[PDB]
Design a binder for this molecule. Structure first.
Ligand code: 533
Length: 347
């Protein structure tokens, strides 16, 4: 049956949650809502509870709310954030206005681990292996993260990693000298073309380099500065890639730049494992068609000690036909409500 709910004011709003969740404490903002840490007395777990802010404010908001719930409900993988619970205090569709999402509370993100310092090669292997294992799963369901960065990669004390915020930033927060843009594939940063899953592999390359050196790979001061930093490392595009830039304006800008050859990665990443260098070379390819995939990267010799083809699962089919569907607010809201009430908690 329905649990008993209790009320509490936390992040400028009244949080109404089942009794099972105790000791609620603000821990910052998440995607499209604020997060509280809590103790789940039913499971004995420390949990993160996110209350979405104005989930049904507009069509865009309502569809976004449905999207996140659909994504979280589908993900059942060790290296991907999953849904422990989803609830509403509402007793019917007509009273339904708030959505609460519950997941594992994670101790630290990759920003906290890096802390301006180099990690050991074995630590890099294990961390990057888990990101790729998670990405293989996500990509197998035709989901693209689109915004992988250290701040959405979370880790427990044993360095077991989970990927947060997949499949979901404004122009302002992408402006200037900001970590929000440093990990983005050039094709999405400058809207060169219809992009796909390979954008995420670029992001892994940027993250892996930073784990190895303790420094941001492409810390651009703006979009243009960042492109110049990228092209200095990987070389300016060839005729083959240029043709694929469907944006006439973006392609015309590219051709104005003085040509530069790809640099020697062994001279860039001094002292690094030669196998790490080789992998970086295969991830940080400008033409996205030619980047190593997650499944291929798991088989690369760098992960020899972690790779197990029988323990790198793929996802069940994910129906996202809703993405091309035009609906009214109340219709997105009703779809969302159905998904809330039909939720079954994990083992
Ligand atoms: C490292 C990071 C921050 N932190 N808080 C306490 N200690 N470290 N931990 C953490 N754990 C879980 C989430 C969940 C987050 O979002 C959610 C996603 C899905 C969900 F069901 C519930 C959520 F709260 C989130 O946005 N952040 C930033 C998180 N951070």
């Amino acid at each position: 049956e329905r649990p008993t709910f209790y009320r509490q004011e936390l992040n400028k709003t009244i949080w109404e949650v089942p009794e099972r969740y105790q000791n609620l404490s603000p821990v910052g903002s998440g995607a499209y809502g604020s997060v509280c840490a809590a103790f789940d007395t039913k499971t004995g777990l420390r949990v993160a509870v996110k209350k979405l802010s104005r989930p049904f404010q507009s069509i865009i908001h309502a569809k976004r709310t449905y999207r996140e719930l659909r994504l979280l409900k589908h993900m059942k993988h060790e290296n991907v954030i999953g849904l422990l619970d989803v609830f509403t205090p509402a007793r019917s569709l007509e009273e339904f206005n708030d959505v609460y999402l519950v997941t594992h509370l994670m101790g630290a993100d990759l920003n906290n681990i890096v802390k301006c310092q180099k990690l050991t090669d074995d630590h890099v292997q294990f961390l990057i292996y888990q990101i790729l294992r998670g990405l293989k799963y996500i990509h197998s369901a035709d989901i693209i993260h689109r915004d992988l960065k250290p701040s959405n990669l979370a880790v427990n004390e044993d360095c077991e990693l989970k990927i947060l915020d997949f499949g979901l930033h404004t122009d302002d927060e992408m402006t200037g000298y900001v970590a929000t843009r440093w990990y983005r594939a050039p094709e999405i940063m400058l809207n060169w073309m219809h992009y796909n899953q390979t954008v995420d592999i670029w992001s892994v390359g940027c993250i892996m380099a930073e784990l190895l050196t303790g420094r941001t790979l492409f810390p651009g001061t703006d979009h243009i500065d960042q492109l110049k930093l990228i092209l200095r490392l990987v070389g300016t595009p060839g005729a083959e890639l240029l043709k694929k830039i469907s944006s006439e304006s973006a392609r015309n800008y590219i051709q104005s730049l003085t040509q530069m050859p790809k640099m020697n990665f062994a001279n860039v990443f001094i002292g690094a494992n030669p196998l790490a260098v080789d992998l970086l070379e295969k991830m940080l390819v400008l033409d996205s068609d030619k980047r190593i995939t997650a499944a291929q990267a798991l088989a690369h010799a760098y992960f020899a000690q972690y790779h197990d083809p029988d323990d790198e699962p793929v996802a069940d089919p994910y129906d996202q036909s809703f993405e091309s569907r035009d609906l009214l607010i109340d219709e997105w809201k009703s779809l969302t409500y159905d998904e809330v009430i039909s939720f079954v908690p994990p083992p």
